[PDB]
Symmetry: C3
């Protein structure tokens, strides 16, 4: 049932990545013991121009650090909780088979470190999130991320892998009201978010921080939805997904414009860059994208291909 | 098109189950005439601790009684509306090919019994519900369940089969406001539910009424979504779905954490219990789970496997 | 490698005929890549949104949804977006079947009484939402600027008896549901995802009565089902029917024997079933308060011979004591 036998070879100290980057393929034919260390940090960050928010984070980012292992691996998990934390925290990983996806075994007070071990029985792309009461609030404050469990043979190779995770956020104030915005439990219970974001901030993946590919390169995006409440009608403006791992499972659908990413769910999308310019990741529940912050940019650099996409060729008078 | 031809043998009086249980496989190589009998009852039940609600029910339960037939069966359906009912009721089954999926053939005023016959043309797991004006209010009051139409060859054998149905509920009062709550039509039209529940109540499937299985046993859950309005980001805390019959169709996705169940839709999930402990079915639109009542428990008992899940191994001081 | 590149267009160019909903252009039945010239006119106009309710719709081709476009994978599409001089706003087009910036929006900014031309190769078979991408994008979409383009596989779709074109939208009026008169767009309601109306083809009863869909007993029906949004996800069902096949999320592969399929905002699905029993079938958003309280219903009327072995109708009303 994911049974490749006991852990072999050297223990692996997992190299985690900050979004939107992804650890390299594990490139391994044997099951291993993987030691994952993950620090919970509560900190003010900018959520919009002139707007700050007290985020609760795995690894100092929203989403949290990307974790990458192989189906059959024994994961020795270390959840550190910085002594500056006001709150105890834990971790539920959707990749974990057992009570709380690890939550029951990872209650960690400030200035403490919980250890627990699990076998990663199933390949997939799995949300992890805090599961400390009140669970909705810990998720709302950005306590979510992704763990890739590679199939035994590994994923087909591509030029670029990217880590993107949508979240709905609940501020006392309305969209782009300046200053430190506290969390609003009432707006959260009502599923009425003030912001809908990729990677924890308006402009998180714009300008200098855009994703980059070149014409001719194949792109895989691991697309998490931490919620807490919204389901993403995930689309990239100007691309078609050649393949979607719908709901993050093993099987693919082909030639998909827009895929639904459940709350506490994920998907994998793959396409090839063919024409230069700006591509926009959106929640195509499209007021989220253009009125609440739910857009990220993939920039394609390289040669125009006018036989695939001409640009504007002609403007003319029209009388009708 | 489900053309196994004319029904053979004696008519079978279908045995329906109360949630969270399922009738056994039909275990059958021929198509039959199946008589289904289902009684509508309006009754006050506990929606939450010290909170009552006037549920409209098929067979005295939310969700209603589970119906199990084979693709190719002719179903002779008898819908009874108890004398005690204030309303007439009817049934739309999603497994029916015809107007209203039965709605038009089954208008049943209090103290009456409608007979209609249909052939189950398509295998699947199909939501049934009342389609009485106002349809929204009838569904919101608990008038939904599942009818399983098996494939000719039956479903792969498993150790446990379970019956869980999500619904959104609209009370005049707020979450956990005590007493008898009326239905609220404003909140329903605005899709702003006060409660989001599995099997018609907070704690319907908690404590002693929890789902049960042992380490090593395969579990199949038929997961309905009655709505009326919400889509379930359906997840089991602590498990992975080895197979999802996504939107209740015949083909499967493998290895999914969370599957979307349409309003008026269904899914089948399947996983093997491997570690003992409490597993929580949730709507992972997670304020529904932790703030509106959308959680049910599956308790697994059996030997620890510390190679798969150690529990907490150490607590250390960290700076 | 990229399938759906068959080299430059061959033979004489094709001047595409676009159809108004709920009809579809016929299958392309062609074995070579073509230069397909598509001409689409944007018109702003008042139409009935419900009984005695006006709305200022923004339209591709005078309808909501916009005219249906049918091309072949590998085709070279020379697009002409013509914005009528009566228009108050400039408009553009994002087709989800286009590979490149804005799916064409960056190549089609068209002021009133102007015509924009841009060219693209249709690299990907499928069923693609197109919509206006002029700011505010949600407002242009909400005013009805969305349609569907079918990019056929080279070998084309399996033949059916009837292909229909249906597209859900959520609408935002200042006034409440069925408050009479010319209803302005309500941005506040749009941002909060609280529509006054949820409709198939741009009006309550656009597909009821005389404008109902039609098919006969024994006929195969494919419906191209768009969701323009702007915000809602359709729990798409036909009352009385089962989807034999769903192209779920509009993709190449099928799910079989599906009651209700989720259609994303800015997404589409294809559903196929065979009519077997006469009567009225209802397309709905099974987020069921939309169907029965906000107008999200369309009718397929099936004419033909009663089949009593499949659906008997009501056989008996007996008295029942408990
Ligand atoms: Cl777009
Ligand atoms: Cl969870
Ligand atoms: Cl229905
Ligand atoms: Cu926490
Ligand atoms: Cu979770
Ligand atoms: Cu009823
Ligand atoms: Cu229904
Ligand atoms: Cu426009
Ligand atoms: Cu779009």
């Amino acid at each position: 049932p994911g049974d490749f036998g006991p852990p072999r070879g050297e223990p692996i100290h997992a190299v985690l990545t900050s979004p939107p980057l992804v650890p390299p393929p594990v490139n391994r034919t044997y099951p291993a013991k993987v030691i994952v260390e993950l620090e919970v940090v509560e900190k003010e960050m900018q959520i919009s121009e002139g707007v700050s928010y007290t985020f609760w984070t795995f690894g100092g980012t929203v989403p949290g650090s990307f974790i990458r292992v192989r189906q059959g691996d024994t994961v020795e998990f270390h959840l550190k909780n910085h002594p500056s934390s006001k709150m105890p925290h834990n971790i539920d990983l959707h990749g974990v088979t057992g009570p709380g996806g690890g939550a029951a075994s990872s209650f960690t007070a400030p200035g403490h470190e919980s250890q627990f071990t699990f076998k990663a029985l199933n390949e997939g792309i799995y949300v992890y999130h805090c599961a400390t009461a009140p669970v909705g609030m810990h998720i709302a404050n950005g306590m979510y991320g992704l763990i890739l469990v590679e199939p035994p043979e590994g994923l087909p190779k591509v030029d670029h892998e990217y880590y993107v995770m949508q979240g709905d956020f609940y501020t006392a104030g309305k969209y782009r009201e300046k200053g430190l915005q506290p969390f609003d439990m009432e707006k959260a219970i009502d599923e009425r978010p003030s912001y809908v974001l990729f990677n924890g901030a308006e402009g998180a993946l714009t300008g200098d921080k855009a994703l980059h590919a070149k014409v001719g390169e194949t792109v895989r995006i691991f697309v998490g939805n931490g919620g807490p409440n919204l389901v993403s009608s995930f689309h990239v403006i100007g691309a078609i997904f050649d393949q979607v791992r719908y709901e993050g499972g093993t099987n693919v659908q082909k030639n998909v414009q827009t895929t639904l990413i459940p709350a506490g769910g994920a998907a994998v999308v793959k396409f090839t860059a063919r024409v230069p310019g700006s591509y926009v990741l959106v929640d195509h529940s499209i007021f989220r994208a253009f009125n609440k912050g739910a857009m990220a940019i993939l920039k394609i650099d390289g040669a125009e291909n006018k036989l695939v996409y001409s640009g504007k060729e002609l403007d003319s008078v029209y009388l009708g």
